[PDB]
Structures are given as C-alpha cells and as structure tokens.
Copies of this chain bind each other. A is one copy, B any other.
Amino acid sequence: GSLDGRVVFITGAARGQGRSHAVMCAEQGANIVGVDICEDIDIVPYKLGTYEELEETARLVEKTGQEMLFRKADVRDKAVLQEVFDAGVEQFGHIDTVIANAGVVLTNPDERDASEALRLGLDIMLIGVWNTFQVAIPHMKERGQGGNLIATSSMIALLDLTDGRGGTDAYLTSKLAITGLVRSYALMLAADRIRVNGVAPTNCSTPMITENPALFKVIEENPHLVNAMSTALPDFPMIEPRDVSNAILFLISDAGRSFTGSVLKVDAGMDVKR
C-alpha cells in the first residue's frame, strides 16, 4: 500500500474520523499509535469516546495485518502525550506522521459559564493540536526522514457562524487558528522535509453530530444560523469519515507528495454554497 513502512500518531482514535484514519492508514501498510481521552467531560453535552471503542479501533487495525499501540490520553496533557509518542517510537522504531484529530463540539443552549467553555475549547482544539505537533517535531527532525503533520480544522468554523457563546467561539477560533499553524509550520519545517497540511470537513456522520441534540437546538434558535450546515452536493448532506481519511491519505502519500501548507476542503461544496 501507499503507507508501507509508515507509522502514524493519531489523537482522538476511539471512534469517528480518528478511527477511520487509523483503520484506513493501516490498510495502506501503516502501523498506528493512537490516543483518546476515553472519558466524558462535564460541559460537553454528548458522550465522548470510550476505552472500549479505542480497543475496537486497535482490533480493526490488527485485522488489516498491521499493529496499533493504543493508550488513554488527553491532548491537554502534553507530557502524557509525549510519553505515548515515545512508547510509539520504541515499539515501532519511529513515528513519521501525525494526525491532530481530537476535538469536541461545545454548542449548547444550556451553557453554564461562557468563559469556562471558551477556555476548555481552546485548550483541547488549539493548544491540544499545538501539543500534538510539539511532541513529534524533535523526533521527526532527529530521524531526518522528513515526515507529515496533519491538523483537522472545520469548514463550518471557516464560514464565520457563531452564537457568541463561549463554546461556539472556542470552536470557531481554534479551528481557524490551526489553519495558521498549518501554513506557518509548513514554511518553518519545509527545510526538514516535514510537510504540513490540514483538512476542513463539512458535517461528518459521527456522534459529535449524530448524538448531540444540543447542536440542532442552537441552529434552530438563531435566525442567522438557519442554513449553517447545508452543503452543495445533493448526495452529501453530510460526508462520511472515510472521505476525510481519503483526503489525508492523498496528502501524506506519494500521490500528494508536493503538498504542504494546504487545507483541503472536504466539504461537498459548502464553501461555495450561497
């Protein structure tokens, strides 16, 4: 496959897009180092990924013939992230690819404290992404075989839709900010042959959307968010996780070898929809 000899570090691998990334990278020959918080968060109004789901991701990876090192870990805990990464380097010899995918949706009409939700969103989706890159770069430079960093942004966030609650604003500002991290790190790391890109998905069928009524009530409550989620293509009112994985696969494989500094819109035309 396209990822033979590759080793991918993936945050948020318990389910959804992260699990899709793990399974589909392994199909192309990659070994996987995955983490997930494996705990709910009080102010996030839907169930997060479980340890049991993370195990299942590993089993799905192992059905491909590849291997997965999986650990419970929070991207806010930088030292823990580094320890799991280092254990990855030990088990597999190296890590050459990083997918910073972990995130949460904080949209909630019953948000209790705006400043708190803002801080939490930023911690997970901005600082957490930065942590995920930080634990990897020294190693990628050291081993001198270049590499790939990938961050998961969001199309909906790049369309300037907020209800002005703290959680929503954290999501928008984090997801935009990380496109800057992508572009700036692409330039910074070019000379080390570390390519850096992102993906900006439109609505993707995962629990964050499919089991999160709070979200539907917030767009139902605001006139300016009435068409917040609509896409262009009739067959894709939402996309599937594999669509996102396929974009990443393109970017990190020989097919997309010259790409760095790009954020691909996996959006079913959401960006042009007017």
Q: Which A residues lie at the B interface, using CB under 8 A?
A: 183-184, 186-187, 190-191, 193, 195, 202, 232-236, 239, 243, 246-247, 249-250, 255-262, 264-269, 271-274
Given contacts A191-B234, A234-B193, contact A186 B258 (CB under 8 A): no
Contact A250 B255 (CB under 8 A): yes
Complex interface: chain B residues within 8 A of A272 (CB): 183-184, 186-187, 260-261
A186 touches which one: B183, B186, B191, B269 (CB < 8 A)? B269
Residue of B nearest to A245 (CB): B255
Complex interface: chain B residues within 8 A of A264 (CB): 259, 262, 264
Measured CA separation A257–B264 after assembly (Å): 13
Contact B261 A271 (CB under 8 A): yes
Beyond A187-B269, A239-B258, 6 additional pairs, beta carbon < 8 A: A191-B234, A233-B258, A243-B257, A246-B256, A247-B256, A261-B265
Contact A258 B250 (CB under 8 A): no
Complex interface: chain B residues within 8 A of A243 (CB): 257-258
Complex interface: chain B residues within 8 A of A274 (CB): 187
Complex interface: chain B residues within 8 A of A256 (CB): 246-247, 250
Contact A187 B260 (CB under 8 A): no
A-B contact pairs, 14 of them (CB 8 A): A186-B269, A187-B232, A187-B274, A233-B258, A243-B257, A247-B255, A247-B256, A249-B255, A250-B250, A258-B266, A259-B267, A260-B267, A260-B268, A261-B271
Measured CA separation A132–B44 after assembly (Å): 50
Complex interface: chain B residues within 8 A of A266 (CB): 258-259
Contact B246 A260 (CB under 8 A): no
Measured CA separation A99–B110 after assembly (Å): 50
Residue of B nearest to A233 (CB): B190
Complex interface: chain B residues within 8 A of A235 (CB): 193
Contact B273 A267 (CB under 8 A): no
Complex interface: chain B residues within 8 A of A249 (CB): 255
A262 touches which one: B184, B234, B265 (CB < 8 A)? B265
Contact A261 B232 (CB under 8 A): yes
Contact B262 A258 (CB under 8 A): no
Measured CA separation A155–B274 after assembly (Å): 26
Complex interface: chain B residues within 8 A of A267 (CB): 258-262
